[PDB]
């Protein structure tokens, strides 16, 4: 009786939450932004092509200076590229070939890499012996790592395939905080501009907004009908966008607690692998399984451009901190910079 | 040539990196990489010890071939999320315990897992090496408790030579892609010295088929 009574109480709370959300909604985003001028066709040409990877490229991250970038591929290689001269600054050989994520520290001193070995390795790029060396091996997870991001040079947050997020301490090497509450394994995370909060999307079709300091889940969003593979904050920090296997993107808001726009098309029936915003927050880059990338405008969900020129799945996608270039990786082992 | 001296030294370093990348990526394409799979209490542990917290990579060599097996057991996450990483392995090695028909039951779970992987969209052409292990005590587990407990449609004799063949044909079904891949099968025992020669012959056949598709005879 107690279990079913708690279940009915939970259902009543969910119903009152739904009623509050429905009472807050008074005018959809598509009704206020029907008067603003639309953007034309976004023609973007390929400027560079970083061709040194042999296997499938699974992750890429831009440096903060907007010139260097790290890429990870399952030939067991972590390559630091110079995007202006196309020069290979570094090539790091990994112990485990099965990687799924890589991060560039906002200082530029460290590179993180994680995969199917349940370990997040931290590599030092600025030693005095000349070569890059593995500094730390954060090993406390029980499922594969799907994302990792530096808060600073000493704190990193990692999402794993065991439904748990974890905030670590590079120096000591232990989990400072453990975020739990997801039921499906988490596939991506995204820090806010100010690093107080961060969202994470899981295979249970939910996106949870955690607070880094208190260690608690603040809000939960459910609008998708399948696994969520990509997530990214709006540049403002008061919204974000998710991309799932149901071939849609969705724009959730944090202060209204409900979604605002859905980016979908009839001709698109493939899942999204990656998503990223522009610098102004107007454009929305979404990489797909149909070998293409698409460019929406968030204020009115009509497709404004297409980035074609990859011969396999677009696995990773990143915008530079200046807003100058867009890097896209793929399973055909080529990175491409667009502008 | 619009490049300073430091820029030229940077380009020289980048190209010296490229040379090592090519050497490594051409040494990698000479190793055979097999993906181990199976259910609980199977023969995966045993076959690893006979041939040689996340993925366990085992390396060994046989007759000028270098194999690396990726035992991905214990990755208790959503398999539909990390299995495309293995699209492009030479062969799968699927272990099934023959004694687990009496102890739905374990054999039906193994058959469901085999049907799940053998028809995956990432393994539409990858060969499968079925290892039906633990036949030594399966030979005596059928003297009592006839096979009808697991398969109610069995009408043959309770002899080992026929029940084992019936199980083998029940497993070599479920292969809806009978034209792109082949299912190799072996009846091994805990004390068996020919378990690596069979996988060698199977991967030799897979290599020969890939070479026939490459040269153009297919």
């Amino acid at each position: 009786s107690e279990l079913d009574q708690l279940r009915q109480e939970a259902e009543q709370l969910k119903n009152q939450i739904r009623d509050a959300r429905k009472a807050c909604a008074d005018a959809t985003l598509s009704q206020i932004t029907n008067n603003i001028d639309p953007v034309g066709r976004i023609q973007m040409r390929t400027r560079r092509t970083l061709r040194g990877h042999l296997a499938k490229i699974y992750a890429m991250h831009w440096g903060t200076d907007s010139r260097l970038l790290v890429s990870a591929s399952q030939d067991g290689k972590l390559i630091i590229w110079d995007s202006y001269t196309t020069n290979k600054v570094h090539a790091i050989p990994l112990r485990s070939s099965w990687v799924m994520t890589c991060a560039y520290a906002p200082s530029g001193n460290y590179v993180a890499c994680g995969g199917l070995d349940n370990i997040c390795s931290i590599y030092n790029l600025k030693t005095r012996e000349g070569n890059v060396r593995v500094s730390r091996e954060l090993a406390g997870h029980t499922g594969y790592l799907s994302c990792c991001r530096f808060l600073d040079d000493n704190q990193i947050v990692t999402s794993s395939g065991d439904t748990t997020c974890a905030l670590w301490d590079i120096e000591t090497g232990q989990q400072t905080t453990t975020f739990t509450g997801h039921t499906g394994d988490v596939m991506s995370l995204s820090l806010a501009p100010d690093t107080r909060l961060f969202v994470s999307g899981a295979c249970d079709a939910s996106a949870k907004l955690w607070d880094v300091r208190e260690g608690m889940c603040r809000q939960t969003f459910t609008g998708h009908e399948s696994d969520i593979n990509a997530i990214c904050f709006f540049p403002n920090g008061n919204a974000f966008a998710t991309g799932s296997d149901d071939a849609t993107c969705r724009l959730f808001d944090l202060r209204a607690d409900q979604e605002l726009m859905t980016y979908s098309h009839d001709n698109i029936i493939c899942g999204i692998t990656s998503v990223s915003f522009s610098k102004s927050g107007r454009l929305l880059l979404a990489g797909y399984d149909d070998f293409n990338c698409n460019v929406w405008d968030a204020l009115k969900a009509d497709r404004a451009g297409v980035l074609a020129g990859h011969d396999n799945r677009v696995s990773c996608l990143g915008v530079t901190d200046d807003g100058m270039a867009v890097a896209t990786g793929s399973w055909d082992s080529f990175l491409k910079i667009w502008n | 040539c619009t490049l300073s001296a430091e820029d030229k030294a940077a380009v020289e370093r980048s190209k010296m990196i490229d040379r090592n990348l090519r050497e490594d990526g051409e040494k990698a394409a000479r190793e055979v990489k097999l993906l181990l799979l199976g259910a609980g209490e199977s023969g995966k542990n045993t076959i690893v010890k006979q041939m040689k917290t996340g993925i366990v990579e085992t390396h060994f060599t046989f007759k000028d071939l270098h194999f690396k097996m990726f035992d991905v057991g214990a990755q208790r996450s959503e398999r539909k999320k990390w299995i495309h990483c293995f699209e492009g392995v030479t062969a799968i090695i699927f272990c099934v315990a023959l004694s687990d028909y009496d102890l739905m039951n374990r054999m039906h779970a193994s058959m469901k897992l085999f049907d799940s992987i053998c028809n995956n969209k990432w393994f539409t052409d990858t060969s499968i090496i079925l290892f039906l292990n633990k036949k030594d005590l399966f030979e005596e587990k059928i003297k009592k408790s006839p096979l009808t407990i697991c398969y109610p449609e069995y009408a043959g004799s309770n002899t080992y030579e026929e029940a084992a063949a019936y199980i083998q044909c029940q497993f070599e079904d479920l292969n809806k892609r009978k034209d792109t891949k082949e299912i190799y099968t072996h009846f091994t025992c805990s004390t068996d010295t020919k378990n690596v020669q069979f996988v060698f012959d199977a991967v030799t056949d897979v290599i020969i088929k890939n070479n026939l598709k490459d040269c153009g005879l297919f």
Partner: single-chain antibody
Amino acid sequence: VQLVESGGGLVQPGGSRKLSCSASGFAFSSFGMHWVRQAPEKGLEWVAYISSGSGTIYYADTVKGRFTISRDDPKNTLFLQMTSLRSEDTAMYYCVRSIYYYGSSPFDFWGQGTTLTVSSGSDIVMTQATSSVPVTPGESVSISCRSSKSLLHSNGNTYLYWFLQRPGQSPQLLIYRMSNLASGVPDRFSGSGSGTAFTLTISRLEAEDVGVYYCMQHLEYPLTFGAGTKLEL
């Protein structure tokens, strides 16, 4: 990280000698090496350079065809074979490592050097309009230099390095481009400049920063240091 040079000694003119330099404690194979020398009482001058993997070699045009620089990667030594030693090739020889990628620090570690004594046009000239500057601790100094042509490349860089040699030791990298402080160097030194005129400002001195401040360009070859500026008292 250390470099130990050996060889040296007394040689008669027209003879030959092989200077060795054993490296220890760093990835020798990924570093290019330079041989630089310093006369008994003069400044620094660049002698030879061998890149990483031995793919590029440069000489100073004062020793070209007479010296041979060669690196051994397995046995970490670096060799300089010298033949037909004239009377101008008498000096202390330093080995200096250098690595070149985007954002690196070339010339970051100088060896100890070995003494060699022998009995009996389009280059860039680095002009340091000073030879000695008297100063007391706590004050701020501004050493200055100027070049023959603009050291500012088209790619935005300005290939000007500021070194420092303390009495009885080897030079030390202070600034590794116009306004780029090296690692391990206190935050008192500050580089600045524009075009062909450059300045090194020290906010407050100490007892461990008096000595000869040199300069160097890396825009073209050969590498030309300026004449030192001595800070005493």
